[PDB]
């Protein structure tokens, strides 16, 4: 990690990381 | 985890950045700063427009309510135009049934727009609001310059409140170059962010005369210095939160509310800039006789 | 520098491992048996943990794409 | 203990905050909202991505616009399906042929071409029953339309005649209003949109030909695009994408939308500058806003604005920093060898002098505004008011477990 | 230029919590790749196959493909792959050897001598943005149609370069977030997290979508079948090893205290020989990489005169790969990079001599080869690893791409092999030394 | 390679490639190029830094003139100069090649008494007797802008059965590629007074196409329904190529019956009615400069001051294998003052890239430079001639804006990316309007009044 200290929480860090696939593709959730 | 490096660098640095200060209030002088709604009266319209759509045929129907090309005064942010210019003449005011000239827009084949809003304030009626704008925004500044002074110490008071609006003064003179206009919310924003800023120099100054009522025989201006280096970082993680209130603000405001956001992020991140260490520097220069 | 020039190391290195190679049989079936065992475990691991995922999020963009 | 408050007060606390955010914030149609998001266009529209906020609920509105209950069923109105032969001479440009490189509404706009014939009645009413892609024998992907039994036979007896005729596939067309003495409301006429051209030549009579196509990989989008014109019955546009309708009454909900997400951002950040432990670095700002919309809700005398949401940012504002005063006070003077035999009691008496600082600092300035501004500053300073009285007395003994909370265990420098 | 707080760890602790999250962190991160390496990015055009005209669509080329772990096929969000990690290690690492007395690195007659801890994770988000503009805008004719990406509206194109640099973001973030419970540090965690995008199908995934429903065919999905040659190259790899596994894992001839049964695992001989290949290939691959990755060319890729000597390069540009290979393996791995860990944190199988027995371990088993992976000589290490990325790059490889990324993922698999073996009773109990030095050997 | 020839007649003067068999320049010898000379206007043009052609041919896969090739094939014709005189009306010119297989391709340039248009009959004759299918083509191909030596300027075509359409050489920044299908109608290129066109008369459908062929030289063309050829047969299809006067109903009397609007448009927005071209661009600079005023700065600071020594720069890296669970508390202990510069980070890099790209952008493809400004001093904004001042005095402005703290060191690592900037800016930049030149003037400008005394 880094020296200055900072904490991204691991279940949000999943939950955001993997947002992209179920969200501004489309088709998947609404086609355009 | 100690050692700072940067302090003499900084005042001198604030000391050219001075000179951009004066051109600041030069621009004020040679374009103007007096522009608004609320301030001093305007007549505004608001419209959403399409980039590669006809403005011509939208400079059209301005045209025609009577509205003429150096008096249009333009500002656009994404997808939004917003034009404003001065209070309309006589019995054809802004708000007039009839004519239908305005009435045009929302109906395309090549000028792709929207109408959003218009907007219309009388002149002696702006300028009641624009005196007592002018007055709030000096009063309340007087008032924190008063407080500053009794509760710790004048000779910092008055390098805070110089400090502090050095970036405002500069910020506001590239705005004042761009025709902003200088609204009550321009003043609720030049109102609100004084303190979240100002707040970081409270800790060091509560800290110093702390440090100076203790001490024995030693000499003030040595424990002034390591005030600052001690109470650092603090004043950097300070007002952290308050900058993330006014970045949700500015994602969600987006267009319509970019200049008040825009007031807002600049304000809140002047006291770490120019900030309390070349303030107590020049009210310890002061200090010591 | 670092051109054609600095001996003694490519031609050593290749008498090298030619004779590293030599007092030695190269290949036996069951000890490939038991890497390529350890390799395709490994591959069907990794495949069925994103055959519950990946691969139900794909079927609709098969679907609708 | 480190909590300061008795248990059955913070499970008290705990169950008021949970239950309370079930508050106010809670609010086939679906697959036809591609051809109804080619309708929202020619306003304006940066970005059509079209989207349902529930199952026969679609929302897509357009940023601060004049108001739109006089065009919603403008904007829901439905093609007849005459579909009739027509020439296009040499260009062969048409609206959804026109899509495939992505689309933008100006050129969608001016997307098109004249028709120099443009006449005789083949197909008329419900007559499709399917469309799809299939990869075909000419290298480039076909889209076909899948035609009813009484459709079929229709073609079917007139095929010969027409194969090698352009025969039009035709949604509703936009027209000028005749009075032209208001904003957003000109009724569309059902039959004019050439969005597809393409020629009889099925031998086939339930399949008709549509011309095929030049997406890279990319075709169910524009395959659902036709049936979707077809098989729609009209949809009224409804709700709001937090943006939305109506200019100045929209500041006020995307700026009540910023006050909400800000603060949320704000414990964000204190989960990420400092450890986590239970629900106490959270306490005291959580019973000030209620204090804050309790105070506002028996005293319902004023007006909203958005002047009174700048308000609700900056007593926001105090709220957060202030509690960002007393945490980074006690770990600081503890890591600059402040007293830990005393700890708690020398916390009470020197942690809270920049609380109280801050927001006295805070106070005379909206007092003095208060008094001598006009119009904004009324409306802005009123909301506050009462959120910086509250604040302070919420904060002062509200915020005390801070102080235990970080002079507990490793006396190791923070 | 740089920051540096804003990529970093969970907040963690002791005491009676969190029991459950055991080999989670160390494979999710692979797992996650996964996802974000399959699937498409945001827009109308993201399914994207390579042209068949002149005047539309990308071309494939095998640079884009070894580091993206992609290929046209679709676009993906985590589509920079290994590229911007690779480049900032060639860059602060490879481009600082210049004038030992201040290039640094080296050995001191004081003790100790690091500081780069930080520079290849920040280094990796300088380039992405930069990168991810440069594939987005490259190829003879885009990747698919026309997306430009400073769009504020018309923004997909811009959409995926910020979900491939937030994307390098959160790469980055698995790389570091494994020390609460998992294991491996350095860049060993990234690669294999990193190139881990092919390997079952034979290809580089995406059976996903392609073959789902009423879909007829895609041709690129003939050479799938073909897992066969795919893992006989991967065994050859493993081939080329020794090949020892003997006896039992009981009482005294343990790698595991408490053992029953002995882990299957050959010991693996040839792991020092890839540290100094790795180093020399990505310089040479990477200037013909950034004229393929910001390609260009009408119709059909540039053959002008600086490009041809670039664009098809690959074939010379290995062989200049399998000479210079001395000079990293000699005068600089050993004096820059660590001579330890051969092979006792690696042999996680039982018995300490073949047969278990006094003395008598063989030249025939792994004696004559132990020696010279610790006294002096380093002749045989590095070679070894370039027989097989001859056999598999002479015939080529149904992956969609050849090259070195193809030797790397494969040793990191051996590595991790080893690692999770113990890891339950390293977690409960104190193991002496963790993995960070490779093996860096030469002479 | 190849060589020119000159051929010779009263309202027509033209000079004929071997290397591909076409012409490549064209004159007009009855109208001078200036008052008081004999020197013809010319018309197509081929030496570097400008090309104007017509590209005569016959395409498809075994093809001679195909336009995916490699160079054009080596033609031989007889001559080396024809001049047409009393006797005869007609001067037939023909260039012949034989490709591999044996078959004999003639084009043949024919050009009569009195007339500004030059007939092109092709030939194949299938004398490798097996089948052929080929294909009547041309092409016309013309850079973007010409300047003086001695717009208008663009691209045509029509159909009989549609309108004409043009479109012309001020907005290719980008550009469409054309996929008409038609019978009948010619393309065209066009400019002050003149035209070239080819006008196919061919029977059956034809495929027209434009192009770029490379960086501001764009193209038009056609390429007519494949003609089936006999073995031992000869076989013939029939064009006319234009050059001269720019009359577009001649040849209907001749013939048989990427970069996007979004952000540019957006930065015109924010000035829209001022009407004063290049002053809003560089006031507009200034402002959002501006808005940059700490970004713009914490862009410099973060390639200044990079390192810390050797005891400050090591970082969480060692201490992670160790897996003991006060990992999370020592992190936050680390660094407190400490700022240590590793490369990147996104943040101060990626923020104010496109909008000084939308500006290159903007003023790289303008037609607004074209007036000077009443305000401004200076004339003259697409001026991009060899020898003057304005490069010299942003290279030195590009190396006054990196001084000032600078504080330089001998290390390897970061020094160079303060310095190679000007380098890099000042050769890259010399090339293009003085407009693009004065625009990163001014973009430096809110950096220099913080640097010192200016007006």
Redesign the interface.
Same mark, same amino acid.
């Given at each position: 990690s880094s020296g200055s200290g900072n904490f991204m929480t691991r279940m949000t860090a999943l939950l955001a990381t993997l947002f992209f696939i179920i969200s501004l593709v489309l088709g998947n959730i609404n086609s355009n | 985890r100690k050692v700072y490096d940067f302090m003499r660098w900084d005042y001198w640095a604030f000391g050219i950045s001075g000179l951009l200060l004066i051109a600041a209030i030069v621009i004020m002088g040679v374009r103007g700063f007096n522009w608004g709604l609320d301030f001093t009266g305007g007549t505004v319209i608001e419209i959403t427009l399409e980039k590669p759509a006809e403005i011509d045929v939208m400079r059209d129907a301005l045209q025609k309510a009577g509205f003429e090309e150096p008096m249009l005064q333009n500002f656009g942010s994404s997808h939004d135009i917003m034009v404003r210019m001065p209070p309309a003449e006589g019995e054809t005011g802004g708000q007039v049934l009839g004519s239908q000239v305005l009435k045009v827009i929302n109906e395309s084949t090549n000028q792709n727009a929207a109408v959003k809003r218009i907007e219309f304030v009388g002149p002696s009626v702006g300028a009641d609001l624009a005196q007592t704008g002018a007055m709030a925004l000096m009063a309340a500044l007087l008032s924190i310059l008063v407080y500053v002074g009794f509760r710790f110490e004048w000779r910092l008071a008055a390098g805070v409140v110089i400090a502090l609006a050095h970036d405002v003064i500069i910020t506001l003179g590239i705005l004042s170059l761009f025709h902003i206009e200088i609204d009550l919310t321009i003043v609720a924003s030049l109102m609100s962010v004084i303190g979240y800023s100002l707040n970081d120099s409270i800790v060091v100054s509560d800290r110093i005369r702390e440090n100076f009522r203790k001490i024995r025989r030693g000499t003030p201006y040595e424990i002034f210095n390591v005030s600052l280096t001690q109470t650092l970082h603090r004043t950097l993680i300070t007002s952290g939160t308050t900058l993330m209130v006014i970045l949700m603000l500015y994602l969600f405001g987006g267009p319509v509310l970019e200049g008040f956001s825009l007031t807002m992020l600049i304000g809140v991140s002047i006291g770490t800039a120019s900030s309390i260490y070349v303030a107590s520097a020049l009210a310890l220069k002061l200090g010591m006789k | 520098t670092k051109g054609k020039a600095t001996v003694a190391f490519a031609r050593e290195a290749r008498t090298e491992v030619r004779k590293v190679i030599w007092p030695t049989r190269q290949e036996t079936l069951h000890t490939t048996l038991i890497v390529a065992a350890v390799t395709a475990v490994m591959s069907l691991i990794l495949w069925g943990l994103d055959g519950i995922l990946v691969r139900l999020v794909s079927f609709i963009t098969g679907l609708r794409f | 203990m480190l909590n300061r408050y008795p248990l059955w007060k913070y499970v008290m606390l705990i169950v008021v905050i949970v239950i309370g955010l079930l508050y106010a914030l809670p609010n086939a149609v679906q697959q036809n909202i591609n051809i109804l998001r080619n309708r929202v266009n020619q306003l304006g529209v940066a970005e059509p991505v079209v989207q349902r906020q529930g199952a026969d609920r679609i929302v897509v509105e357009l940023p601060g616009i004049q108001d739109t209950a006089r065009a919603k069923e403008i904007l829901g109105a439905t093609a007849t399906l005459e579909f009739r032969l027509v020439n296009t001479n040499v260009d062969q440009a048409a609206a959804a042929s026109g899509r495939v490189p992505g689309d933008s509404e100006v050129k969608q706009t001016r997307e098109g071409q004249p028709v120099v014939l443009y006449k005789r009645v083949i197909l008329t009413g419900d007559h499709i029953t399917d469309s799809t892609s299939s990869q075909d024998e000419y290298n480039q992907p076909q889209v076909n339309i899948s035609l009813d039994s009484a459709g079929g036979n229709i073609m079917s007896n007139f095929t010969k005649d027409n194969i090698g005729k352009p025969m039009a596939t035709l949604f509703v067309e936009y027209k000028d209003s005749g009075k032209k003495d208001a904003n957003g409301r000109a009724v569309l006429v059902k039959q004019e949109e050439v969005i597809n051209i393409a020629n009889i030549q099925s031998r086939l009579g339930n399949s008709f030909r549509i011309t095929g196509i030049n997406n890279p990989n990319e075709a169910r989008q524009l395959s659902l695009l036709l049936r979707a014109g077809a098989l729609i019955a009209p949809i009224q546009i409804v709700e709001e994408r937090t943006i939305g309708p109506t200019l100045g009454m929209q500041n006020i909900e995307q700026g009540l939308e910023a006050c909400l997400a800000g603060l949320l951002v704000s414990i964000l950040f204190m989960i990420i500058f400092y450890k986590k432990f239970g629900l106490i670095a959270t306490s005291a700002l959580i019973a000030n806003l209620i204090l804050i919309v309790g105070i506002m809700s028996l005293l319902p005398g004023a007006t909203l604005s958005m002047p009174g949401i700048a308000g609700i940012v900056l007593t926001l504002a105090v709220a957060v920093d202030a509690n960002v005063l007393i945490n980074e006070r006690i770990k600081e003077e503890l890591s600059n060898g402040r007293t830990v035999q005393q700890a708690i009691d020398e916390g009470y008496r020197g942690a809270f002098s920049s609380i109280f600082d801050a927001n006295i600092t805070t106070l005379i300035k909206v007092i003095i505004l208060y008094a001598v501004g006009t119009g904004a500053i009324k409306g802005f300073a009123i909301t506050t008011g009462i959120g910086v009285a509250t604040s302070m007395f919420t904060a002062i003994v509200g915020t005390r477990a801070i102080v235990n909370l970080l002079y507990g265990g490793k006396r190791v420098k923070k | 230029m740089a920051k540096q707080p804003g990529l970093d760890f969970q907040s963690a602790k002791g005491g009676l919590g969190e029991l459950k999250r055991r080999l989670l962190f160390v494979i999710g991160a692979l797992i996650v790749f996964r996802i974000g390496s399959f699937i498409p990015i945001p827009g109308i055009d993201a399914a994207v196959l390579a042209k068949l005209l002149e005047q539309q669509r990308g071309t494939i080329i095998e640079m884009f493909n070894m580091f993206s772990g992609g290929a046209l096929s679709r676009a993906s969000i985590f589509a920079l792959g290994i590229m911007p990690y690779i480049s900032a290690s060639i860059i602060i690492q490879l481009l600082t050897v210049v004038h030992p007395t201040l290039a640094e690195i080296k050995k001191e007659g004081e003790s100790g001598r690091r500081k780069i801890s930080q520079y290849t994770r920040y280094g990796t988000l300088v380039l992405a943005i930069f990168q991810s503009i440069g594939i987005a805008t490259g190829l003879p004719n885009m990747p698919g149609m026309q997306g430009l990406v400073i769009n504020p509206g018309f923004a997909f194109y811009f959409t995926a370069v910020v979900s491939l640099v937030t994307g390098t973001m959160f790469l980055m973030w698995l790389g570091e977030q494994i020390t609460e419970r998992g294991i491996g540090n350095g860049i060993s965690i990234i690669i294999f997290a990193g190139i881990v995008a092919g390997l079952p199908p034979a290809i580089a995934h995406t059976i996903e979508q392609a073959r789902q429903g009423d879909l007829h065919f895609l041709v690129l999905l003939l050479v799938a079948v073909l897992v066969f040659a795919v893992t006989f190259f991967v065994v050859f790899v493993e081939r080329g090893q020794r090949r020892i596994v003997v006896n039992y894992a009981k009482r005294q001839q343990g790698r595991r205290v408490y053992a029953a049964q002995s882990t299957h695992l050959p010991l693996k001989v040839n792991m020092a020989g890839v540290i100094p290949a790795i180093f020399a290939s990505s310089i040479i691959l990477f200037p013909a990489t950034i004229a393929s990755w910001f390609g260009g060319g009408t119709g059909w890729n540039w053959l002008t005169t600086i490009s041809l000597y670039l664009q098809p390069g690959q074939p010379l540009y290995v062989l200049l790969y399998a000479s210079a290979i001395i000079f990293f393996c000699f005068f600089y791995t050993a004096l820059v990079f660590n001579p330890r860990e051969t092979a006792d944190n690696l042999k996680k199988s039982g018995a300490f001599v073949p047969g278990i027995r006094p003395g008598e371990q063989t030249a025939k088993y792994i004696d004559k080869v132990m020696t010279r992976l610790t006294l002096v000589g380093a002749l045989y290490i590095t070679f070894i690893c370039l027989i097989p990325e001859f056999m598999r790059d002479a015939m080529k490889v149904p992956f969609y791409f050849g090259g070195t990324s193809l030797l790397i993922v494969v040793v990191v698999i051996m590595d991790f092999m080893a690692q999770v073996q113990t890891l339950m009773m390293s977690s409960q109990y104190e193991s002496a030394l963790k993995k960070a030095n490779l093996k860096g050997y030469g002479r | 390679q190849g060589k020119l020839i000159s051929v010779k007649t009263d309202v027509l003067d033209l000079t004929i490639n071997t290397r591909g068999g076409d012409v490549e320049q064209a004159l007009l010898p009855a109208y001078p190029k200036e008052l008081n000379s004999t020197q013809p206007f010319q018309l197509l043009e081929t030496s570097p830094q400008f090309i104007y052609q017509a590209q005569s041919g016959l395409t498809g896969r075994d093809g001679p003139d195909n336009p995916?090739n490699g160079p054009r094939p080596l033609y031989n014709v007889e001559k080396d100069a024809y001049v047409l005189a009393e006797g005869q009306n007609e001067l037939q010119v023909p260039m012949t090649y034989t490709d591999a297989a044996g078959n004999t391709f003639t084009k043949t340039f024919v050009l009569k008494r009195g007339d500004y248009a030059v007939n092109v009959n092709y030939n194949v004759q299938n004398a490798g007797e097996k089948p052929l299918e080929i294909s009547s083509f041309g092409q016309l191909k013309q850079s973007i802008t010409l300047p003086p030596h001695l717009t208008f300027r663009g691209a045509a075509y029509s159909?009989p059965?549609?309108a004409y359409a043009a479109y012309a050489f001020d907005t290719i920044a980008d550009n469409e590629?054309l996929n008409?299908?038609?019978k009948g109608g010619w393309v065209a290129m066009l400019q002050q007074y003149f035209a070239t066109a080819w006008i196919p008369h061919n029977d059956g459908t034809n495929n027209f196409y434009t192009?770029? =062929?490379?960086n501001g030289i764009a193209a038009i063309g056609y390429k007519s329904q494949p003609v089936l050829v006999q073995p031992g047969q000869t076989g013939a299809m029939n064009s006319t190529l234009w050059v001269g006067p720019e009359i577009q109903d001649k040849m209907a009397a001749v013939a048989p019956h990427?970069?996007?609007? &979004? =952000?540019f448009? *957006?930065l015109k927005?924010?000035?829209?009615? +001022?009407?004063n071209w290049g002053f809003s661009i560089i006031?507009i600079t200034?402002?959002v400069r501006?808005?940059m005023? &700490?970004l713009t700065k914490a862009?410099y600071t973060?390639?200044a001051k990079?390192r810390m020594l !050797?005891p400050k720069?090591?970082? %969480?890296?060692?201490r *992670?294998?160790?897996?003991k669970?006060r990992?999370? !508390?020592e992190?936050?202990? @680390?660094?407190?003052?400490?700022? +240590?510069?590793? *490369?990147?980070?996104?943040? #101060? *890099? =990626?923020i104010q890239? #496109?909008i000084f =790209?939308?500006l290159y952008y903007m003023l790289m493809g303008s037609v607004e430079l074209r007036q000077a400004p009443f305000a401004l001093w200076i004339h003259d904004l697409s001026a991009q001639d060899p020898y003057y001042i304005l490069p010299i005095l942003m290279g030195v402005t590009m190396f006054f804006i990196q001084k %000032?703290?600078p504080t330089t060191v001998?290390? #390897?690592?970061q020094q160079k990316?303060m310095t190679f900037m000007p380098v890099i800016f000042t050769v890259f930049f010399l090339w293009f309007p003085s407009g693009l030149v004065l625009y990163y003037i001014v973009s430096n400008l +809110?950096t220099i009044?913080?640097?010192? @005394?200016i007006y």
């Open positions: - | - | - | - | - | 995916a159909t059965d549609a590629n008409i299908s038609s192009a770029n =062929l490379g990427f970069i996007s609007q &979004p =952000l448009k *957006l927005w924010i000035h829209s009615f +001022v009407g006031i200034f402002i501006g808005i005023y &700490p862009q973060s390639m990079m !050797q720069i090591q970082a %969480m890296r060692e *992670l294998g160790d897996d669970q990992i999370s !508390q992190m936050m202990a @680390l660094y407190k003052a400490e700022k +240590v510069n590793p *490369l990147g980070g996104c943040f #101060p *890099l =990626l890239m #496109p =790209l939308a %000032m703290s001998t290390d #390897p690592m990316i +809110v009044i913080q640097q010192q @005394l």
